[model samples]
Target chain A: NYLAVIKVVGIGGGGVNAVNRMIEQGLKGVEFIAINTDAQALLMSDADVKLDVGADPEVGRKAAEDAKDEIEELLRGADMVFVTAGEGGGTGTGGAPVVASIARKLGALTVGVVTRPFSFEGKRRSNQAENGIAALRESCDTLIVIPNDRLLQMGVSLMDAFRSADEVLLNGVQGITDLITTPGLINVDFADVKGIMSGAGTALMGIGSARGEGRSLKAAEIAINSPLLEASMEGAQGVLMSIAGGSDLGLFEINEAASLVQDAAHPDANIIFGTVIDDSLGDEVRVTVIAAGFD
Target chain B: LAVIKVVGIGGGGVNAVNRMIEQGLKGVEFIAINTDAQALLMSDADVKLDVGRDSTGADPEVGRKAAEDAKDEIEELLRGADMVFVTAGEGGGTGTGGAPVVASIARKLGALTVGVVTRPFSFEGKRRSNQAENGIAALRESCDTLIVIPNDRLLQMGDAAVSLMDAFRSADEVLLNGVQGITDLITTPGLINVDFADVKGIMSGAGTALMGIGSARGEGRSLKAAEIAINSPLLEASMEGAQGVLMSIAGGSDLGLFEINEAASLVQDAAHPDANIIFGTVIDDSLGDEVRVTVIAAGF
Candidate 1:
């Protein structure tokens, strides 16, 4: 029943970089497209659909408008679309919103997942990112804004900090797509995803994995309190979650996870979940969650 | 990448294929066919075809006849297959009889065909063993390579407390790993390459063979993984006079080149020096800290 067409598009330099990393080690069953104003960077991308919007330098939003028709045709028939960008520079900050708007126009449930520039990058870059985030948030049904500064708090080196940020995009896309594409015992179809994500703003995501005994509760706790996106689910209106593990995964463990999630939710919060039996997981259990409409 | 297919025939075969589907094998299609309509429906394969004799018979003759009547349908299902793996639990009616028929058709379709099947337990009696022997002979003629896994060897796995169901399940894991390994070898790009030609050379006319797989993590993980794989009782071959060997190692992103090189050497040390040894490494991030070694000792 999951014959839904899905596309993940990367807009501009920062977005294209994420797409390239994702292509190397990411989920299957989704089409990947890279859009960039810079020709050389666009050529370096590994995504199947590559579009160079311009010989562009500072022209971000204009370049996106120039290629609007081509973008629509490429993303045509998509039931769901994911737009990723790093919102600090000319192309990424400006081009991303227009792309998300086009996907929305095509009747796709568009999700905007983009990076917020680090504070150290200066007030000019900071202001540009805030405007881009505002434009991007209005364009899609829901938006996940990953603060780039969170990586620095981990005490990692400069290059490692940036590289580690890629994990946010990789895990977010992989977990959500795998949830929809793979058939599970408690199915999470495209409709379930649309139910929680539609009209939801500024969602928060986290992943937790553990092995051996007591893994179910342990994984749940870690996911809810994930350090990457440090936030509480106290007043969130919706929860989207998935549990993936080996055949060793039992109903008791699943119940434990559900009970924990229930305890963390508001009474009226919309919660949808599923279980994926992945033998490659061995004895381990991996939990992924996205909480939205936070106060 | 080449178009590869795993065809699971009969009840046992379909069960194994369903497990494979649950775990997910990237870049391959799965097919299931059986005499029992309801049994075939339980499988989650991409293509499901039922060849009916109207009953689930224990008679291999009936099994052969059912496949005989559905030759055209099988051919159409297997169209565009660059490689085909016929998986079944042997000594049963459809698996013992129909598997060879399916493999023969796959071979004629110009696909490099391999048969991954299992033998019955000793307590299933001499009749089943005799039938398995006949099945292996027939299968060998049809396939480029035939790997016969002895199910009783699973008892030697050191877990004396397992149920009878676990016995069957363990054998299923063996076949699943073998099929996944070969598929990953061709599809997963690595430091070294062993394309279809290299595989075809080691496999074609290689006769009855052996396949064993093991994976582990931590210190000296490479050697330990290969050690467990080579030492697995599932490998019913001695590798004394094997004509060729194909080995594949899969590790996570952090897998060092030295680890890859050492793992291959460990498997090689256990095998005949004169054997045409071919090996490669692939990066599968899902494995995490673990490194897996899969070995196919052919023409023994």
Candidate 2:
């Protein structure tokens, strides 16, 4: 079957930044859009599609709600949709949920990746972000929440901190894109990805890489041991793996890596894997694992 | 499995690799090749080779000849290795002279060779520094990736006031961490992995590599550790023109996806946008709430 058409949309300044970062990180073959009430911020972004929905979160929300026909048109034919936003602000906090809801109505497998405001940004903003998250969650299949304060741990400089926040967004987007786009030897395709997404209640993506002999084993070990995963894979309902390597990669290497993942996951869990041969990879191998299960 | 070997040539090189082994480097063979029989005997390497009758006595010419004398013997140790690390302290006779020769042999044998050489401190005098520079030049031409850590830079790291012994230890730590970082990137898997080929692509054509490390524990540790790594003086060159980067974060199970994203993004921003960035994460229960960030930025 043909790959699913994916659409990634940014809903506000924070959301736009996430979209821009994905572009900057060189994500390809997908439509990228930025929707905002702040015209100035919207203009600053380099998203391929830009939608202005008046000013303030209230206006942005109303625009999304009232222009149901237009929202549907934008989301038409999107098999999968990712909505990114910074939840505390007027536009992102208000518009993201509406956009996600529209995408969901269009029968797209929708996911929301959003950020909460820092504590110092004021109680009102924090409350807004929290509320925005709740709305976004209700409108999407799965939701990934990132707290801005957590990003502050990355750098002392403001520029560094903001860039870090953008990075978190880009990773989530790319993780999914790579999962679907990269050709696999065992061949987990768009349908398989969709199947996993359907069961992705509270999903987490982990990536790991290693090369120079036993690369697959090493890569698998790292993915299983990633610190970002709050839970173990033993109870996960589904595990999807994307393995990439060079021409020198052998079938056993792929089998070995996949077997490790299967072992780490629950025996009853649904497991699927794909392989991509990239000459540029040389002897190195990279593995991306998406484990989905409710907490 | 890939056969990886670490060769220590001369006194300085032998000591450094020995420290790395002691620090828990696994799945690699360690070899100490020296002109001094006594020093070779004292080393804790997996294999020891005596090249000449006596020490090079700080004479690079003598050191070079000794390596030539033991060409066949050293070659046997490096054969079939997919990757080889040649470590030595330049300026000293054996290390300066033998490092290039060993590196050349590794390359000829078809291994992805790396040279980790140290330049002497200024206090060691201009003559020694000049000798070290010459050795570095020779080593650079022979290896795919050559990393030169100036001993003087160690003094500039951390607080301004520190003991000489502490500074030396720090210097050793830098070398150890740099080598370990590369090996980890090549052999270990993480949440976001950078394969060995990626590393070779960045290092092969690039002149030399810059390495930096930072770690922090407890709350908000990932970001703090990331900042320290990006800002480390060792990575100054990377912040400018680095074309590729390999970053690894090791943390306790408490580490979150947001932290990995934040750290990776900050690191990417610190480098050129065009730079290739590959990163990964490892979890260890013993790490508790602690996190360690290691970075190797290559391409001058």
Candidate 3:
């Protein structure tokens, strides 16, 4: 009863790669779809729904526009939709926004998570990506932008950087979805997330994990100081902090971690947080921080 | 009107603040505080305060002592500020030690304080980096938000062929633009006004922020400017996961609502779907055909 229907759709080649990676890593209770103009890429992606839109962003956009009825049918019952794509390219640049616009029109909480090409990729492509982002922003409830160059700062090679990008996307999706689906000692549900997130502007989610002694505190520290995030947590009007811990997790540990998070944010920040106990956690602690309310 | 103040601590801070003033930052009070009397005297800040005798001689403990000794004066200088920008170069005595003290005082006096500090490069030695890190940790605790700029990063920009002086100038330019971005968002009026409270609401608890500025003139200027702003090198963070964006557009009388929407939409598309975006615009005859865009993105 608590879980909200969630659909993750990968658009274009880069997007399909991300989806296939997520599938291989194993995401539960999530429907995966691959939409692409590149027939070969679509064929390669093992998604529950495979949509072929033809070549290029314009064609991809036109295909989706013409097949609105078909696209809507696939997205009809979803409570929330995540549209993933890599901008500055043909299919994803054009197709992702079209999908998000359709989903938003259908009244779902739509979020767009896309990556911009690296500087080495040329200015023309960067310009195209920026243009696509503008189009997508008009349709989605929230938009998260990740620059591929920043991912390079993690000191990984180009191939590993792409892999890291997929991991980041997975963590973000799973983090929010897990918060809503899992029962917690201090509970928050889909309605709570929707209530705080609607019209709240762009949002950021961070995940950190630690094992062994003082894992809760360590997890909180890592999550709050997540290096992958480009934005800060300063002016956030609202924050939702969630923790997943082993059965041995103590109430005091949870309280300590929560208060540390509180102290790290603005004093007047409105905070809603919870903790879930899982037998599979063992001695590890995982913290997820979702901050919203950008002016 | 928001009561905004920019405080420069120590020799490096004083110089940076002086450079900012020369670059045309209006509508804010500029104060330079230092343990070095000669450097304080040389500063062009509107107000200057010398915390102790002569210089701290690069000893952060002495710098800290000086600020502690003049706690009341520092507090008075920072009092009633709605927001405070504390600028310094960590590793040096006054900047490393005194900055956090001044920030702490500002926080206590009910101001939203942001600390902007620079880290020394590796060539400058490991000792300096360690000191800068320690100072950064303290400043991070004292200020509501902190923006750390590494000199090494600045050196690495633009084919790595930049002269030392030019690299430092670029660093100053980044800081000046950042300060301008925040002040303009809070002070300037727009067609769809995003006031000081909205700026505060978006930035208050944000630990660090990234800012960029871009301008374009002639036809299709809005989209062109949006592209430039989003792709500017000054914005080092990936736009993908940002939590919020505060966008301010200054355009000429010929600016159309449709153009504004186009620019705003493009900017929104560049951020995380969950990011909150609040924007404003200023129309002026002086702007002519030119349009300027300033953005401050918060969250990490």
Candidate fnat values, all: 0.00, 0.00, 0.00
Per-residue alpha-carbon lDDT of model 1 for B2-52, expressed as tens digits?
A: 778899987778888888888777778888878775666567777666664
TM-scores for every candidate against the unseen true structure = 0.51, 0.49, 0.47
DockQ for the candidates, in order: 0.01, 0.01, 0.01
Local error of candidate 3 at B113, Å?
1.5
lDDT-sorted candidate list, best first:
1, 3, 2
For residues A1-295, what per-residue lDDT tens digits would candidate 1 score against the true structure? 3487889987765666567667767567789998866422222355889887851224668888888999999888998999886433556567888888999998888988877666765566346667788888999888877776765654254334545566766767767777787766666768978988888988877678888889988988888777655664777788877888876678888889988988887778888888777778888888888888864
Candidate 2 residue spans exceeding 4 A from truth: A1-295, B54-56, B158-161, B283-286
Which structure is stronger by lDDT: 2 or 3?
A: 3
Which should have the higher TM-score, number 2 or number 3? 2
Alpha-carbon shift of residue A208 in model 3 (angstroms): 60
- The global C-alpha lDDT for each of the candidates, from Candidate 1 onward, is 0.77, 0.73, 0.74
Candidate 3 lDDT by residue in tens digits, B158-237: 45677767776776776676676667656655566777788778777787666666889888898888877776655675
True contacts kept of 2: 0.00
DockQ score for candidate 2: 0.01
Query: Alpha carbon lDDT of residue A50, candidate 2?
Result: 71
- Candidate 1 wrongly placed segments (more than 4 Å): A1-295
